[PDB]
């Protein structure tokens, strides 16, 4: 069961709409994730937009208790890979920004642009369980025009 490798964002959900719209810090276009269990770290590479222009990031988080990871970006973040199939990952993240406001978010990742409904139904369920309404879900594949 390989979790490390190429991963592209298809959908994102958020308890705070301010964090996931156009040019927001969390409209994230994932490209790859590498879990380094020997050194208890995770490597994240993705694009985001500021001023409507693609910018690339490469972050390094640290593994913490209970399969969770801490990583700094637009504040402090603690996330976990809630679900994993051969075709997708569903990540749950809690962010506390510089102002101290807390936001819970979910993301569905895949190996490309062709979504499997079975994975998508699970993403919606996890999103719902986190108290996030369907109307707070954004289609990222539709918005990802950044470099491969
Ligand atoms: C999984 C969708 C993006 C969530 C997410 N974006 C960041 N930037 Se840090 C965070 C933690 C999960 C890697």
From Swiss-Prot:
> Which residues form each disulfide bond in the chain?
54-146
Q: Which GO terms describe its molecular function?
A: odorant binding; small molecule binding
GO cellular component annotations, sorted alphabetically? extracellular space
Q: Which UniProt keywords apply?
A: Disulfide bond, Olfaction, Pyrrolidone carboxylic acid, Secreted, Sensory transduction, Transport
Q: Name one GO biological process term.
A: sensory perception of smell
Cell compartments where the protein resides: Secreted
> SUPFAM superfamilies annotated for this entry?
Lipocalins
Which interval of the chain is the signal sequence?
A: none
Determine the domain of life of the protein's source: Eukaryota
Main subcellular localization, coarse class?
secreted
Subunit composition and interactions = Monomer.
Q: Provide the function of this protein.
A: This protein is found in nasal epithelium and it binds a wide variety of chemical odorants.
- From the Swiss-Prot or TrEMBL record, give the protein name: Odorant-binding protein
To which species is this protein native? Sus scrofa (Pig)
